Design a protein around this ligand. Structure first.
Ligand SMILES: C[C@@H]1CN(C(=O)COC(F)F)C[C@H](C)O1
Ligand SMILES: [Zn+2]
Ligand SMILES: [Zn+2]
Ligand SMILES: [Zn+2]
Length: 459
């Protein structure tokens, strides 16, 4: 109960237009053999080219939608499309490349997958809506065998080179021509009525159909993300650390404490309505305020309607005091809000393309986030950068260049010169803030927010 048994049945109805006469009774073992791959009864870490839905969810960073369309099948050219937007034409003799033989097409496939995946995953998972030509084209660019390590490092092998007879990971495969031990999953095996477009269009209006293979590849991965991360949610699955995860999460905690502490000091709200994570803790535990929590899990489909979160009969009066929405995605924030909203458009190794404008943000856990929409912030303004501290000016225990800044809200800056301690803390805070912003988080606040009101907390 870990891998997909090769003896599991494979429904072949979707394959019978490309492969007429295909047997209805089919296993992964017989299908893999039909594809031209010999498994030789190998107990060396690669029991099946195909994987379970559960294993595919654990390796979502490796997902590459793949489709093959007949341009004209041994005699006809094939259009190979990938969810990266690339279309390659292979001759047997939205980027669109002209027809070239397989020996050069396979070098491009390896280069493209390596650049897309080296900072995301240790493997590739081809996400298919299998009709036949994609499965039969794999023998022209895929090699299989025992699990291996890279020739230049300790990572698992993802590529093979016929020129040198060596194996490489995604980071060391320059000049390699074969994809080695890829994984794959057929979305058609999940139980669907109707074609790819009809199922995809039920949940997404952002991916159209220009009738090229890459359009189908994108729609296939999109539908798979919808099924595994939008209609079904598993927040218990852990994902490996691949970048700045720990620094981003630490920065998020620091920024939240800073902004909320300052909003309470500047406007002295008698009550704070904390809307979001049912396991949230008070981000400013020493604040005088009446802290009230409201449970809402992360929305993965569409943003919450403020009318459903707040109305239908709690302080009841959400208009009293301030509302804190820390990564709680709503359609239109109330005017009295402090907000952190993840911008789905951000380019990063943590943020993967999602469904209907949304993105899949993977940092320890996977969170499909609804599309970022600027109109949600109409009653608020962007929160300006600032650093506030009421801690004593005392160095304790890296060198020094005098800090001059209008945004260092400290007693030392009020009285002229910034002390070394507050200058060090200001620089660390600025780095944390820039880290969080660059990760894709955006901050918004009630229009009356004014850091000028923080200087009088030093009297
Ligand atoms: C396009 C060149 C030439 N090549 C072949 O044509 C041999 O391919 C054969 F061994 F599979 C190998 C090299 C990696 O790319
Ligand atoms: Zn390597
Ligand atoms: Zn889509
Ligand atoms: Zn100071």
């Amino acid at each position: 109960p870990t891998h997909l048994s090769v003896d599991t049945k494979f429904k072949t109805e979707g394959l019978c237009v490309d492969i007429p006469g295909i047997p209805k009774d089919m296993t992964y073992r017989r299908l893999i053999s039909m594809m031209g791959f010999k498994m030789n009864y190998q107990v060396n870490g690669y029991p099946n080219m195909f994987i379970t839905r559960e294993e595919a969810i654990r390796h979502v960073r490796a997902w590459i939608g793949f489709d093959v369309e007949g341009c004209h099948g041994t005699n006809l050219p094939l259009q190979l499309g990938f969810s990266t937007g690339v279309n390659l034409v292979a001759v047997p003799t939205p980027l669109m490349y002209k027809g070239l033989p397989w020996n050069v097409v396979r070098i491009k496939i390896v280069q493209m997958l390596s650049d897309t995946l080296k900072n995301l995953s240790d493997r590739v998972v081809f996400v298919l809506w299998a009709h036949g030509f994609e499965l039969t084209s794999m023998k022209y660019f895929v090699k299989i065998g025992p699990e291996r390590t890279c020739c230049l490092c300790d990572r698992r092998a993802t590529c093979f080179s016929t020129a040198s007879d060596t194996y490489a990971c995604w980071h060391h495969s320059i000049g390699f021509d074969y994809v080695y031990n890829p994984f794959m999953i057929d979305v058609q095996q999940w139980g669907f009525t109707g074609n790819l477009q009809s199922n995809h269009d039920l949940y997404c209006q952002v991916h159209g159909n220009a009738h090229v293979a890459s359009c189908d590849a994108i729609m296939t991965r999109c539908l798979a993300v919808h099924e595994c991360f939008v209609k079904r949610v598993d927040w218990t699955i852990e994902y490996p650390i691949i970048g700045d995860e720990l620094k981003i999460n630490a920065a998020c905690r620091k920024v939240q404490h800073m902004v909320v502490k300052a909003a309470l000091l500047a406007d002295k709200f008698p009550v704070l309505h904390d809307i979001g994570n049912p396991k949230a803790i008070k981000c400013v535990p020493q604040a005088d305020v009446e802290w009230k929590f409201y449970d809402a899990q992360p929305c993965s489909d569409k943003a919450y309607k403020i009318e459903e979160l707040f109305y239908s009969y709690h302080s009841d009066k959400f208009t009293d005091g301030v509302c804190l929405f820390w990564n709680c995605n709503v359609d239109r924030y109330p005017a009295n809000s402090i907000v952190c909203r993840f911008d789905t458009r951000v380019l990063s190794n943590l943020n993967l393309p999602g469904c209907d404008g949304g993105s899949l943000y993977v940092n320890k856990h996977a969170f499909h986030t609804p599309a970022f929409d600027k109109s949600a912030f109409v009653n608020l303004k962007q929160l300006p950068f600032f650093y506030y501290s009421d801690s004593p000016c005392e160095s304790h225990g890296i060198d020094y260049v005098p800090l001059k800044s209008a945004t260092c809200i400290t007693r030392c800056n009020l009285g002229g010169a910034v002390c070394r301690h507050h200058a060090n803390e200001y620089r660390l805070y600025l780095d944390a803030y820039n880290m969080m912003i660059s990760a894709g988080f955006s901050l918004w606040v009630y229009k009356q927010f004014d850091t000028y009101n923080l200087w009088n907390t030093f009297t």
